[PDB]
C-alpha cells in the first residue's frame, strides 16, 4: 500500500537455509544434548550479533 | 528388468505372457480403466522405486531400459509378495 513503514525491519538479511523471551537464562550441557537444539537456545529469538555468532 | 516388467503387467491384466507385446504404452493395453492403470503404476513404484515422468505414455519396451540401469537382480517388495501368493494360494500343498 505504497508505505515504507509497514516493511518488517531486520538487523542483517541472509544466512537463512530454506528447509525450516527470557532475559537471564542458564544452560547445562550433558552427553546427550543435541548440537542443533544447543545453538538454537544460545542464539535467541531476536536476529542480532548473538544469532550470527552461534 | 524387461522380463520382470512384462510379468508384473501380464499378471495384473489376467493375460498370457505372449498376448502382451513390449512395444506398447501402459495406458494403451489397459482398457482406459485408469484404476487398473495407476494400480500397475502403484506396483512399479513398489517394485523398482523411482519412476520416469508419465510412465503410462512411453512403451514397456522403451520403459524397460530406464529401470534396467538402476535395478539389479534383487526382486523386492511387490514381486516377492505375488510369488508368496502363487505357491501358497495354489497347490504345492506340502512343499513351500
Amino acid at each position: 500500500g505504497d508505505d515504507e513503514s509497514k516493511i518488517p525491519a531486520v538487523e542483517y538479511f541472509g544466512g537463512e537455509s530454506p528447509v525450516d523471551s527470557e532475559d537471564s537464562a542458564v544452560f547445562k550441557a550433558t552427553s546427550s544434548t543435541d548440537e542443533e537444539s544447543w545453538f538454537k537456545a544460545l542464539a535467541g529469538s531476536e536476529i542480532n550479533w548473538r544469532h550470527a555468532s552461534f | 528388468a524387461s522380463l520382470l516388467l512384462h510379468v508384473l503387467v501380464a499378471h495384473k491384466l489376467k493375460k498370457s505372457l505372449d498376448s502382451i507385446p513390449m512395444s506398447k504404452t501402459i495406458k494403451d493395453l489397459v482398457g482406459g480403466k485408469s484404476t487398473v492403470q495407476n494400480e500397475i503404476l502403484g506396483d512399479l513404484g513398489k517394485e523398482f522405486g523411482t519412476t520416469p515422468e508419465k510412465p503410462e505414455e512411453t512403451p514397456l519396451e522403451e520403459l524397460a531400459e530406464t529401470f534396467q540401469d538402476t535395478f539389479s537382480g534383487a526382486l523386492g517388495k511387490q514381486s516377492s509378495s505375488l510369488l508368496s501368493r502363487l505357491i501358497s494360494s495354489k497347490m504345492p500343498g506340502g512343499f513351500t
Binding site: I7, P8, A9, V10, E11, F13, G14, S17, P18 | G45
Partner: protein, 128 residues
C-alpha cells in the same frame, strides 16, 4: 482426482470417500482421512501463492530486499549474471558485478588449465 489436478497448489485437499486405497505420492486422500482420530485426518495441501509469496524486508542500514527463498540464503537480491563463455571470462567484470552487490558465475569455458584459472580467481579476490 480430476478436480485435484485442476486446482493442485491452491491449498485444496481432495478426499475420495468411495474407495479405500493408499496414495504413494499422498497428493489426494482416501476414506480413512475422514474417520481418522490422529493428526493424519488433517493434512493440508500447499498453496503456491501463499507459501512462496515474494516479500520486502529492510536492513538496520535501511536498504530494501526482494525476500524470496533464494534471496533468504545468499543475503543479496535474487538476480544473478549466469555463466557466459565469452562475457564471464575476465576477472575485471566478475569482480565489479560482485562490487555492485550481485552474485555472478565465473565460466571455466574460456579457461584451459588448473594454472590459468587459479590466476584468474586470484585476480577476482584481489578486486572484490
Amino acid at each position: 482426482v480430476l478436480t485435484h489436478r485442476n486446482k493442485d497448489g491452491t491449498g485444496v485437499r481432495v478426499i475420495v470417500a468411495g474407495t479405500l486405497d493408499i496414495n504413494p505420492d499422498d497428493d489426494y486422500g482416501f476414506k480413512q482421512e475422514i474417520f481418522d482420530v490422529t493428526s493424519n485426518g488433517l493434512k493440508k495441501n500447499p498453496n503456491w501463492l501463499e507459501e512462496y509469496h515474494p516479500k520486502l524486508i529492510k536492513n538496520k542500514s535501511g536498504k530494501i530486499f526482494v525476500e524470496t527463498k533464494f534471496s533468504k540464503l545468499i543475503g543479496r537480491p535474487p538476480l544473478l549474471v549466469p555463466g557466459m563463455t565469452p562475457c564471464t571470462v575476465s576477472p575485471d567484470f566478475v569482480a565489479a558485478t560482485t562490487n555492485a552487490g550481485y552474485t555472478i558465475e565465473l565460466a571455466g569455458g574460456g579457461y584451459f588449465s588448473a594454472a590459468g584459472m587459479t590466476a584468474a580467481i586470484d585476480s577476482v579476490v584481489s578486486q572484490i
